[PDB]
PDB file of C-alpha atoms and ligand atoms in Angstrom:
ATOM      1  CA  UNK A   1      47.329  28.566 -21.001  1.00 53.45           C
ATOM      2  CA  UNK A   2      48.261  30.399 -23.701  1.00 54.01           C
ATOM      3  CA  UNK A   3      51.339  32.628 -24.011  1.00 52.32           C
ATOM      4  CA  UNK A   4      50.989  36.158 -26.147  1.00 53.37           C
ATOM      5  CA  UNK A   5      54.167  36.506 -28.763  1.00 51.07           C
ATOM      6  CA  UNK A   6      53.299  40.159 -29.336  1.00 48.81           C
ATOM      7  CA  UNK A   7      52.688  42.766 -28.386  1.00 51.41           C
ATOM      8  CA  UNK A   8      51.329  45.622 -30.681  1.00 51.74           C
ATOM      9  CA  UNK A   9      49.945  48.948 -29.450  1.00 53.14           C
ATOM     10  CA  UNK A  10      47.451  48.049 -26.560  1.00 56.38           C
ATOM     11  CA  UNK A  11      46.840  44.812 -27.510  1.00 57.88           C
ATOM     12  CA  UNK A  12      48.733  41.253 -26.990  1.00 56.80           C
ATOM     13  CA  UNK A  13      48.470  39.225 -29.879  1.00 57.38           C
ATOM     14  CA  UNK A  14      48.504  35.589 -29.111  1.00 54.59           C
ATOM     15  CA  UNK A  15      48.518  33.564 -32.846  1.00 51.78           C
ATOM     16  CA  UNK A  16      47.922  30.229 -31.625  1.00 52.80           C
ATOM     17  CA  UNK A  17      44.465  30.781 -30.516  1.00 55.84           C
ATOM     18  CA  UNK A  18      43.773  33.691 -32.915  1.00 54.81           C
ATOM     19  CA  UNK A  19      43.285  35.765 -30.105  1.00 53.36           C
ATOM     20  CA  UNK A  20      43.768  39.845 -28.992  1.00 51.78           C
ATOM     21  CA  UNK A  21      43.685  40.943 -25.795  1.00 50.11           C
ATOM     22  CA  UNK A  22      43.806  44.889 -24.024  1.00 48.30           C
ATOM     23  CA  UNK A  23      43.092  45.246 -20.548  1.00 47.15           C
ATOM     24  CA  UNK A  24      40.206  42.742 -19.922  1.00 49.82           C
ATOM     25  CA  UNK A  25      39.245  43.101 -23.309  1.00 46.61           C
ATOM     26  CA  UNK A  26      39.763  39.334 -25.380  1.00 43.25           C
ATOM     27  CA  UNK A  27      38.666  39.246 -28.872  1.00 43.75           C
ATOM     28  CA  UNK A  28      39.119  36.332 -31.344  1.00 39.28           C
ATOM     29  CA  UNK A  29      40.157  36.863 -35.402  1.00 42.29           C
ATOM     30  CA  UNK A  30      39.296  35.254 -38.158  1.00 42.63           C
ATOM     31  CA  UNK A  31      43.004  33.064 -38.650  1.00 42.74           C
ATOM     32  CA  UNK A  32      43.858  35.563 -41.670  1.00 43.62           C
ATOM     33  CA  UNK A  33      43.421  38.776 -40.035  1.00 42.61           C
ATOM     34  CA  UNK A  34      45.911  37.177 -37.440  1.00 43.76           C
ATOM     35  CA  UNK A  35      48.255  36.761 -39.912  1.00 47.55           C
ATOM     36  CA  UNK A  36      47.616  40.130 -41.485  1.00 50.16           C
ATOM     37  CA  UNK A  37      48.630  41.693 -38.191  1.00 49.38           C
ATOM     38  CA  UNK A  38      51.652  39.463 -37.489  1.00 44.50           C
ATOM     39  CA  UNK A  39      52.869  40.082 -41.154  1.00 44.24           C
ATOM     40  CA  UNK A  40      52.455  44.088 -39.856  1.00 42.79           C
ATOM     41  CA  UNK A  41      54.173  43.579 -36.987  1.00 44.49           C
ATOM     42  CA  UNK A  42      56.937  41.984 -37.872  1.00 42.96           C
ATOM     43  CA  UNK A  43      57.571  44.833 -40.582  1.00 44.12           C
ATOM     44  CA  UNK A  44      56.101  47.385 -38.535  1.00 43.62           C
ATOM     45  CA  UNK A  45      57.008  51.169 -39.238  1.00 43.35           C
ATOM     46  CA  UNK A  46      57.169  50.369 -42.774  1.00 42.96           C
ATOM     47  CA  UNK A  47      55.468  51.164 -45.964  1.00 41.23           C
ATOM     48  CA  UNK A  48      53.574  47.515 -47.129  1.00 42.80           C
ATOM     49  CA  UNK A  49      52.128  47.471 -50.438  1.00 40.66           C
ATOM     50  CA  UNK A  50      48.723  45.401 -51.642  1.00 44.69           C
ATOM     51  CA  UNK A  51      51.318  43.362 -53.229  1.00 42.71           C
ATOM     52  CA  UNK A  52      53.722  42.651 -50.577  1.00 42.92           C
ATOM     53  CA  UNK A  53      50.607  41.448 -48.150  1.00 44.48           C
ATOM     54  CA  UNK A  54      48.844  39.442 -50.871  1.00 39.19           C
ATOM     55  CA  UNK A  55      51.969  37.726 -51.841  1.00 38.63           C
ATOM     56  CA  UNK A  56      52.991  37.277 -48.058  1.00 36.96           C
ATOM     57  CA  UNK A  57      49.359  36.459 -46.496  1.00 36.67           C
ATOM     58  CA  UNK A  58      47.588  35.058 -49.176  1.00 37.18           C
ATOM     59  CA  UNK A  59      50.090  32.791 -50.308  1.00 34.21           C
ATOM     60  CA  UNK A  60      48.469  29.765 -52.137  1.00 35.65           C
ATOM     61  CA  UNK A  61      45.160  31.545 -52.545  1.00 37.81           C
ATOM     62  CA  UNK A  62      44.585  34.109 -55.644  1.00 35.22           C
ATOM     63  CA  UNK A  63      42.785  36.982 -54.350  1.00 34.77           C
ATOM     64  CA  UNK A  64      41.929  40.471 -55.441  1.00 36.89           C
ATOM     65  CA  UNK A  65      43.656  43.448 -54.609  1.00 35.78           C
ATOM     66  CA  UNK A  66      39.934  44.364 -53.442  1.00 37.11           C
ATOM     67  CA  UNK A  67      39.893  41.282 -50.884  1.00 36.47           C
ATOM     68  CA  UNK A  68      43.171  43.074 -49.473  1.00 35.80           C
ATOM     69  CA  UNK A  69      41.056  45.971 -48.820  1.00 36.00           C
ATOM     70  CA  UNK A  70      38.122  44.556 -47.250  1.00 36.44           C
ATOM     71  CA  UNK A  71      40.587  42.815 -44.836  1.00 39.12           C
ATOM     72  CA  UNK A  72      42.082  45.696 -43.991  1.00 36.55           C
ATOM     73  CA  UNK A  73      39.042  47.690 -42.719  1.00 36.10           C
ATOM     74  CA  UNK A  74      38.009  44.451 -40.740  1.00 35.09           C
ATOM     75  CA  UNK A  75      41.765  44.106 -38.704  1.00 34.34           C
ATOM     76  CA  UNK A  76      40.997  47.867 -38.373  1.00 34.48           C
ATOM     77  CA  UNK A  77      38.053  47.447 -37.154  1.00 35.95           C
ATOM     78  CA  UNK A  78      38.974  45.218 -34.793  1.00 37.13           C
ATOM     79  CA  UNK A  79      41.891  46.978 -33.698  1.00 36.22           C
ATOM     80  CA  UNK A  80      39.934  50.038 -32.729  1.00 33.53           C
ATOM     81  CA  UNK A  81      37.129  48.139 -30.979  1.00 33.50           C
ATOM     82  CA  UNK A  82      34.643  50.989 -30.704  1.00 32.72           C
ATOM     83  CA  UNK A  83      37.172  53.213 -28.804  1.00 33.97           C
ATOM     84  CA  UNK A  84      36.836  56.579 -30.439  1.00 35.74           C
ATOM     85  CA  UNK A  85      40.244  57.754 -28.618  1.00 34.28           C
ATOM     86  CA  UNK A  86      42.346  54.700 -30.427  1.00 31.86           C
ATOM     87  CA  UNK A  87      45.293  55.571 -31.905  1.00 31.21           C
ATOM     88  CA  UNK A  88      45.758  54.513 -36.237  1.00 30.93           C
ATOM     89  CA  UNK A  89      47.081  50.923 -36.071  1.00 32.30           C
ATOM     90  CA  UNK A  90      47.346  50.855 -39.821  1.00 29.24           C
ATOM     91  CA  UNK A  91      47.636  54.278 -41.962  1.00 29.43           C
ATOM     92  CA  UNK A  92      46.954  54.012 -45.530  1.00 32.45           C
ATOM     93  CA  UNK A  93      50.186  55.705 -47.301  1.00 33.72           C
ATOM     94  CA  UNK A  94      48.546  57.513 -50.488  1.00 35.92           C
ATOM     95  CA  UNK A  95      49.220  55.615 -53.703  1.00 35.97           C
ATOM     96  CA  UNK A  96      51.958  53.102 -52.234  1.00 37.72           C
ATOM     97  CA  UNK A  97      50.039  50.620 -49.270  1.00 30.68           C
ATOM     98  CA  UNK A  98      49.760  50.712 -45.362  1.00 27.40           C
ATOM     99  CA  UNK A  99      51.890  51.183 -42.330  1.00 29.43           C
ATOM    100  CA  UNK A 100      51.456  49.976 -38.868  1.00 28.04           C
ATOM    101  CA  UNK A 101      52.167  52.891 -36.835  1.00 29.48           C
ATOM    102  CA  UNK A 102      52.150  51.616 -33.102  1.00 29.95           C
ATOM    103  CA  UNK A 103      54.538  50.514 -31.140  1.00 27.50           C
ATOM    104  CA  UNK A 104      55.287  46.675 -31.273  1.00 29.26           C
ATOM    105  CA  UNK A 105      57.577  44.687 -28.284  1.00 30.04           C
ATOM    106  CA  UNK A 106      58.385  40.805 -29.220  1.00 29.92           C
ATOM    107  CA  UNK A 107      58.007  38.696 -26.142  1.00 28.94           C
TER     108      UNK A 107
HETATM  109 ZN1   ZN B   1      60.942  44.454 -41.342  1.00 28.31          ZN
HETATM  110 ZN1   ZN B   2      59.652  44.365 -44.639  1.00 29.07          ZN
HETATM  111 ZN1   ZN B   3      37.496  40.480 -46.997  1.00 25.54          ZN
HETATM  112 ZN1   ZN B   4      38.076  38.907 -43.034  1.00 28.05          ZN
HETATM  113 ZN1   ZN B   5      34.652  38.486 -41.817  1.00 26.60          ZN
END
């Protein structure tokens, strides 16, 4: 049984099964999305560029700045879940990246 090692906004983020979780609500991730939102969290409440993720969550893989994009709508997508009243997880900071803008607790 699997422990969560995050916490971030609503949802416990448990890496080792690729797994989020909110109040009876479990949802797996494709393994990079995971890391996406661990790489977030662990600089959370700060400005990321395209760079700094590629470079940090694409490492060994060439990818476009447009893949970086498409990823980001899916974790997004995920994060929100259909819940129209969701906070922004990530906010895209004009010309410079993204920021994850909920609160995150380390367990
Ligand atoms: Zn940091
Ligand atoms: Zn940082
Ligand atoms: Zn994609
Ligand atoms: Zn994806
Ligand atoms: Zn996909």
């Amino acid at each position: 049984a699997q422990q969560p090692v995050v916490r971030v906004g609503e949802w416990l983020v448990t890496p080792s099964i690729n797994q989020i979780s909110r109040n009876g609500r479990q949802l797996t991730l494709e393994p990079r999305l995971i890391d996406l939102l661990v790489f977030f969290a662990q600089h959370s409440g700060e400005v990321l560029s395209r760079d700094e993720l590629i470079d940090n969550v694409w490492k060994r893989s060439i990818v476009t700045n447009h893949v970086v994009t498409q990823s980001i709508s899916e974790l997004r997508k995920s994060l929100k879940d259909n819940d129209e009243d969701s906070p922004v997880y990530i906010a895209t900071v004009p010309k410079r990246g993204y920021k994850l803008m909920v609160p995150v607790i380390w367990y």
